Amino acid sequence: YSNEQEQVLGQIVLANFANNEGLASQGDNVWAATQASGVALLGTAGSGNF
Amino acid sequence: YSNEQEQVLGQIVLANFANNEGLASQGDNVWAATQASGVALLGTAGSGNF
Amino acid sequence: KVAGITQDFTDGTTTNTGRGLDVAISQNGFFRLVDSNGSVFYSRNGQFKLDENRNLVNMQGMQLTGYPATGTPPTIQQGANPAPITIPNTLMAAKSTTTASMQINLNSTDPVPSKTPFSVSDADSYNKKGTVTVYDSQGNAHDMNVYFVKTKDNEWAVYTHDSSDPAATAPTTASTTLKFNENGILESGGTVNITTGTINGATAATFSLSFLNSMQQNTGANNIVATNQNGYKPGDLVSYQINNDGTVVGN
């Protein structure tokens, strides 16, 4: 912006599952978390396995 | 520079593999070291096999 | 007439797949599976996937078994019972340097008479400044600075110095000495147990630094041609891979 800078608005969160592979297909291109998938692990792009 | 000289800033390091040939293709034109490639050997331009 | 049903186990084909742990098998052999109720079964069902429990299963749903791994790095107990194969997503602990190697090639005609002081800076007092990175008990990196000082033909004085910590005071004493024969072959001073220095309570490991097969020869520049840091830092499970020998490994 006009005040001569960049500011952080937010950080997109990425999710990995134990199995990715196991997700329940929905909508448009939407997946629901499942027991098969396990619980999603959150992180950021370029961190861990994201 | 203005003080009438040349000074060393650094030395670019070059890497050779056992196999060069075996590297894992990535990004833009980036390769990852692999077991097939073996471990990179470091050196300078005009030295050894660099 | 009466009938007797049989099944002919000829090999199939292999099918250019690439998702999951699509492990095919040639010739004879069955995968050993275990049903959750403690029952052993056999199958050629090459389709395997990791479930939410970090277990390899088919679909079906039965557990793929194999030999357990133990030690650090893990080793395969072939004589052990066919345990269920699991793949944890938890971290590789750092492993202190235990030993280290350092293959050195020195120019036979490179003396140091210009100076005698050290303090990791008096260039004239040495011929080679090499640094080996080592790990302490928390994996904290340390700077094993090594100085090679030609005192004479076939005798080089060695000074050591951990520049990653304040504890590494001016390395003005001959940590060791190397002896070579007339052919430039390292005859003595093979290895020295050298401290790593310390950080955040992590102990100063110490490790056996070997100069095995180092040589003093007419040609070349004082150099380092392969060195090894026997240990690790922390690790995160990037990927899964299966070798054709049935080993399951973590990258």
3 state SS for chain C: CCCCCCCCCCCCCCCCCCCCCCCCCCCCCCEEEEECCCEEEEECCCCCEECCCCEEECCCCCEEEECCEECCCCEECCCCCCEECECCCCCECCECCCEEEEEEEEECCCCCCCCCCCCCCCHHHCCEEEEEEEECCCCCEEEEEEEEEEEECCEEEEEEEECCCCCCCCCCCCCEEEEECCCCEEEECCEEEECCCCECCECCCCEEEECCCCEEECCCCCEEEEEEECCECCECCCCEEECCCCCEEEC
- In this complex, the residue of C20, C89, C238 whose CB is nearest that of residue A21 is C20
- In the numeric block, which tokens belong to residue A12? 């997109």
CB distance C172 to C159 below 8 Å: yes
Distance separating alpha carbons of residues C155 and C216, to the nearest angstrom = 9
Q: In the structure, do chain C and chain A come into contact, i.e. share 3 or more CB pairs under 8 Å?
A: yes
Distance separating alpha carbons of residues C230 and C196, to the nearest angstrom = 13
| Cα-based distances in Å from C141 to C90, C94, C190, C209 | 22, 11, 24, 16
Residues of A in Cβ contact (< 8 Å) with C21: none
Cβ separation A48–C52 shorter than 8 A: no
Q: What's chain C's Rg over C-alpha atoms?
A: 28
Which residue of chain C has the CA closest to A37?
A: C52
Which residue of chain C has the CA closest to A40?
A: C52
Distance separating alpha carbons of residues C231 and C72, to the nearest angstrom = 10
Distance separating alpha carbons of residues A26 and A31, to the nearest angstrom = 5
Which residue of chain B has the CA closest to C226?
A: B41
Residues of C in Cβ contact (< 8 Å) with A21: 20, 49-50
Edge-to-edge strand ranges of the sheet holding C128-135: C128-135, C141-152, C155-162, C176-180, C186-188
CB distance C131 to C146 below 8 Å: yes
- In this complex, the residue of A19, A35, A49 whose CB is nearest that of residue C50 is A19
In Å, how far is A2's CA from the nearest CA of chain C? 42
Contacting chains of C (3 CB pairs or more, <8 Å) are: A, B
- In this complex, the residue of A18, A36, A48 whose CB is nearest that of residue C236 is A48
DSSP secondary structure code for residue B42 in this structure: E
CB distance C212 to C101 below 8 Å: yes
In Å, how far is B2's CA from the nearest CA of chain C? 27
Cβ separation A49–C237 shorter than 8 A: yes
Residues of C in Cβ contact (< 8 Å) with B35: none
In Å, how far is B3's CA from the nearest CA of chain C? 25
In Å, how far is A34's CA from the nearest CA of chain C? 9
Q: What's chain B's Rg over C-alpha atoms?
A: 16
Experimental determination technique: cryo-EM
Per the DSSP assignment, residues forming a β-bridge with C158 are C148, C176
Q: Which helix (H) or strand (E) holds B25?
A: strand B24-26
Of C249, C244, C247, the C-alpha closest to C25 is C244
Per the DSSP assignment, residues forming a β-bridge with C232 are C95
In Å, how far is C235's CA from the nearest CA of chain B? 17
